[PDB]
Amino acid sequence: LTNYLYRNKVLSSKSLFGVSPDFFKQILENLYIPTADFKNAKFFTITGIPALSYICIIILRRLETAENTKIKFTSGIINEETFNNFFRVGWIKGVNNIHDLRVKILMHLSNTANPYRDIAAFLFTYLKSLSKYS
């Protein structure tokens, strides 16, 4: 479950709650996905999970208030290309990748701003690699 979001190893993981490495072919081939460059990972991360994506967005402009720079995201989902698209359409300097932005989303999500701190807190509990982010 902590792998299932924000680890980039879900497709490489032999077990997805009991699931082998597939699902990537067909529906993505029926209509080609216009994204690439770790397109699998954003299908998995908490900012890329459609229901949890907007919860990060609700965190995002709370983080934006925390960072004192306000700007509206293009979509309710946060991933690699959308953040680049959001960049190319006014914000803090020093971060330009989605890896650190998801970090700043998650630590604020680990604050009692939404009742779904439980997911963010559990992610930082395991593993020890995620513990240092908190």
Partner: peptide
Amino acid sequence: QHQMFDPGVADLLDTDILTSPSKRKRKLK
């Protein structure tokens, strides 16, 4: 796009109606 599932799936079924516009139009009505 003729198959909603893998080629190993479409072996049991048949995408002939999706491939053929005549059957595609006949099935709609």
